[PDB]
From a paper:
The I’m Not Dead Yet (INDY) protein in Drosophila melanogaster is a homodimeric plasma membrane transporter composed of 590 amino acids, belonging to the family of divalent anion–sodium symporters (DASS). INDY recognizes intermediates from the tricarboxylic acid cycle as substrates, with a preference for the dicarboxylate form of citrate at pH 6, and the anion exchanger inhibitor, DIDS (4,4′-diisothiocyano-2,2′-disulfonic acid stilbene), strongly inhibits its transport activity. Therefore, our biochemical characterization confirmed that INDY is a DIDS-sensitive H+/citrate symporter that predominantly recognizes citrate in its divalent form. Each protomer was divided into two domains: a central scaffold domain (TM 1–4 and 8–10), which plays an indispensable role in stable dimerization of the transporter, and a peripheral transport domain (HP1, HP2, TM 5–7, and TM 11–13) responsible for citrate binding and transport.
Apo-state structures of INDY were determined under two conditions: using nanodiscs at pH 6 and 8. The apo structures occurred in three conformations: (i) outward-open and (ii) inward-open conformations in which the substrate-binding site is exposed to the extracellular and intracellular sides, respectively, and (iii) an asymmetric conformation containing elements of both conformations. At pH 6, INDY exhibits two of these conformations, outward-open (43%) and asymmetric (57%). The ability of INDY to adopt multiple configurations in the apo state highlights the intrinsic dynamics of the transporter independent of substrate binding. Furthermore, the existence of an asymmetric conformation suggests that the two transport domains of INDY can slide independently across the membrane via an elevator-type mechanism. Furthermore, the two protomers move independently across the membrane.
Author numbering:
A (entry chain B): 32 to 200, 215 to 584
B (entry chain A): 32 to 200, 213 to 584
The structure:
Amino acid sequence: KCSNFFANHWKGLVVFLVPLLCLPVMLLNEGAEFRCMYLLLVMAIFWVTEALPLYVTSMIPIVAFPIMGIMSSDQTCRLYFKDTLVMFMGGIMVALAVEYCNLHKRLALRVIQIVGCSPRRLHFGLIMVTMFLSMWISNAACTAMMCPIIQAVLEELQAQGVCKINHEPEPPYPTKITLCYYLGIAYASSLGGCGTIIGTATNLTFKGIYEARFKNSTEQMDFPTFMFYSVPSMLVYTLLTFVFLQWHFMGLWRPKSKEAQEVQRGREGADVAKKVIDQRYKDLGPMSIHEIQVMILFIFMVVMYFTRKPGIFLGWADLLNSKDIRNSMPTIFVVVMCFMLPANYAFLRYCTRRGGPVPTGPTPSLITWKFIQTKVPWGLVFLLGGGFALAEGSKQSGMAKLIGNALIGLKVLPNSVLLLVVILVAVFLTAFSSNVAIANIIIPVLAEMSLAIEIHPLYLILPAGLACSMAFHLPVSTPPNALVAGYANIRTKDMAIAGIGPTIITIITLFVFCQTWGLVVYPNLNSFPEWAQIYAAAA
Amino acid sequence: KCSNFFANHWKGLVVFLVPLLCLPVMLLNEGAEFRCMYLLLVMAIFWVTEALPLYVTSMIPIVAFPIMGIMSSDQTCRLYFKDTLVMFMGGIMVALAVEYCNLHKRLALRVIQIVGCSPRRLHFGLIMVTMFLSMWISNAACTAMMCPIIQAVLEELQAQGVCKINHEPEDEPPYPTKITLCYYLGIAYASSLGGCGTIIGTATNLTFKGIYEARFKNSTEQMDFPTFMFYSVPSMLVYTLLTFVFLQWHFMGLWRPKSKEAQEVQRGREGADVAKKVIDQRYKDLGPMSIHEIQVMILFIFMVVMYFTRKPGIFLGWADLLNSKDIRNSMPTIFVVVMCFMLPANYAFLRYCTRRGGPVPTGPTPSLITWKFIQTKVPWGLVFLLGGGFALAEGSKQSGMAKLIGNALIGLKVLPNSVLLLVVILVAVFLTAFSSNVAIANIIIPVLAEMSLAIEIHPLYLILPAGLACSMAFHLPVSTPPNALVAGYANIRTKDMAIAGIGPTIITIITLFVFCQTWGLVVYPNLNSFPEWAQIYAAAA
Ligand SMILES: CCCCCCCCCCCCCCCCCCCC(=O)O[C@H](COC(=O)CCCCCCCCCCCCCC)COP(=O)(O)OCCN
Ligand SMILES: CCCCCCCCCCCCCCCCCCCC(=O)O[C@H](COC(=O)CCCCCCCCCCCCCC)COP(=O)(O)OCCN
Ligand SMILES: *[C@@H]1O[C@H](CO)[C@@H](O)[C@H](O)[C@H]1NC(C)=O
Ligand SMILES: *[C@@H]1O[C@H](CO)[C@@H](O)[C@H](O)[C@H]1NC(C)=O
């Protein structure tokens, strides 16, 4: 009678108790830093527990800071909707423009055709396409985008009798082949998210927190440098994840395995069937001018990102040196040009052209605002802004001093083991809650800790920021896992066991690359830079 | 043939040509102010003609200001999503919380019980309530407050067969019917008009009162809370009554029995008794206010009170008590929004904790509102629209638009005092149609003060009419936040709103030009004369 009470109403218990239980933090101290600490604990517990929706929890600073002495109500609101957040929202809008006209389907099917259609070749192609797409699209959107293709080819194969999707007789148990495919798509989404600033919200969160805390940093996490740093590691552990998934499910390096015979009979007599369904499902027709325009706009946007401030030459944002331009001009420019440009050019038949029949009305633009209004996760505005505002309040109130001086006991550890334990803590934390919440909670703490110790702040922030996105064990860990578990009726035990591979691979790959090749990207990780010394002296 | 080309593809033609045709204003002048003037002209043309979606057009400043060198990109984005914008979005969310539970249905049924279920009487009652309420609260707050109530009233009238909410019909939202336009534009216009009643009615009044007081100390005439109300309320009542009459004439064909709109209203007038029996039956079959509705109503009342009791000028207000950091009205609004998620819907969970029987809740108890509902119903483009207004105002200040527009106003000194008053009112009305009211007040009020000092007339005689005129904007959704909120809630095309706003504009201009010269003399006897302190100020100048 009481157990099910805690089963059903534990979230309300957390909401009602946590502020009261954390009240002694304010009541037993004097400075505003302890009020900010009370707020930080309450918000962090709400984020990890998800007692309140993350978007709703993120609006707490707007109430708390003005009531306390932290900042005025105007500054707190302006902390929301920063420049980088506008860039991310515009990136989401452009990704929706790409999803409109089904450019993603065309690209995915074309690449799957280019790669072989053998079951292992199919799996490799699916992972590669999903990773490349998730580099520019939200992970959940990319997962729900790629799942239909593998689903359809699976019903085709099962109808042909080659293999069975679910075990013969609770929802049906998925077989190892379909588990491999779906888990591969989900893990590919998660891994490909880490390779770009706009790939996932977590990257933007920790990049923005680092840029806000350290404005004087010589090392900058702009779009091209971050992509340079992160792409090789992404490729390495994506390939290794694919290899592990093949070995665990499809019996790689096990010619005598039962699963190996499954793949073998899928190779003979099913390659033709699944190829045929690939071209049939590629009935999108010839490349329309609409898709071509969307592709050109997207490529132009990326090129503008790379040309903002290169060291090799000047480029824009240095020709226009009157003010800072900062990567929001290209994105919003592309978003607006999506609405300006038409999608037919059939109206040109009026001006001395034969063509065909004239249009009956106004030609549609590349995208409709109804589509944007209904497929943008607008709560990310509040979530990212709340992270930024909490970081700024922690800086201003005095949380930095308290936490840094409290956690100075880690100075005795060597840098390598400190990096290892930071990565392990980040992975363990993000295994149970949303990645953005974990980044918001830990990144300011890591910055202040690395200031207290004599450690370059990036050396701990960047590997941990990447590690916050490596969630593979539970459906609650990240939206793609929940989507896949819903699609394929994946039992939590199977996913938890299969996540051992990607977790270890990502941990080792990060721990090796951030020490070897991260030095190649930024040559100053090992030392303590001058600006870090100035910041430490100030705080 | 080629005529059909213009008929079908004129929007894209405007999009492609207007930047090119307006480029000369940039080219022939060598100033960042003229660059900003080009940007403003292009955005205004796109707004009036609706070549692009309004929300998309509001995105242009992010691209334009950094490129044009007016202001940095990080600053430009932060001018979006200001404190006031958070207040607006929170107000919309609280309105959605009211709409989630059928509280708006209850309010509409009670109001219809009170009034008598006649479209004219109901419209007049809602207009009066909105006016009196916006006398004390921010205009956008009252508009968002009243929108669900108006929706419920229209739904009830539709159910009784009195009218249709929307025209019968691919992606564009349904076109509102005449009566829907009448009611929604009515509450928007009523908010705008009632905001001019009191000092705390809207931020524009506080702004220009502060400007006058700071510029002119040692002044015999003051605009404190009682005197300003005594001066403004009669003229405001005249605005509201005449605007109501015009809205009735234009939409339901008042004084026009031949019009088809009159016939349907006359048909709806029939059978009032059976209508009221049906209405109070529909009120009765609704159960008593559930704890969901009671809690959301208590939260809404608390939010309204906190709005009113912050720096009212009559007494202390909680803002001055918590003066360590500047707290504004987004605090109570976001607090209410958060509490709408924290508080439960029912309380059966503790009911079975008391061993008082009853069915134990089988699952988590829902909160007062679900984020899925908010993500779907909030018009999120309002963020870009209202932020675009704010950022465009700030860019006008920084670039040099403010100084340039003021320099043009100096030339009006040659006109005679009555003609000068009319011209100033017209200029204020025209300017406020493209910018936030506070911005236009900041643009024109100091110039008016200096010009009045130079021409030796009482500064209030010009400041009050123009200070009030800065708030009457009824032609475009960008002109004032209430219009944008109404257009978002009920999809009102800019053509209909622009053609409907002719009435209120002319009405307000005429009644101001009359009531200043007549009634202000009753309020301020020294209004026509040039007081001694004004003489010493001019001598100092
Ligand atoms: C020097 C400065 C000092 C400053 C001090 C500030 C202190 C206050 C800080 C904020 C506190 C907020 C408290 C109000 C919100 C309480 C929410 C309780 C939710 C609730 O009833 O949950 C249920 C269990 O409740 C339970 O087991 C407990 C019973 C709860 C009964 C209602 C309690 C709240 C009454 C109103 C309080 C108003 C406070 C206003 C400030 C299960 O809910 P679920 O999990 O099924 O669903 C949850 C989603 N709906
Ligand atoms: C220091 C000084 C700096 C100065 C800077 C100045 C910048 C000026 C920029 C001007 C150009 C950008 C804005 C216009 C973009 C193109 C708009 C095309 C509109 C269009 O084609 O409309 C159709 C008719 O076009 C026509 O009849 C027009 C002729 C055909 C136009 C074709 C346009 C696409 C190809 C060229 C693109 C060039 C892009 C350059 C950035 C009818 O469309 P509809 O109304 O049926 O449907 C509309 C659905 N939205
Ligand atoms: C920024 O860092 C440089 C060295 O990297 C230092 O010379 C300069 O004083 C710093 N500026 C501030 C404002 O701390
Ligand atoms: C303003 O100050 C001057 C200074 O002598 C004084 O003569 C004048 O009477 C004052 N104005 C009023 C309205 O008292």
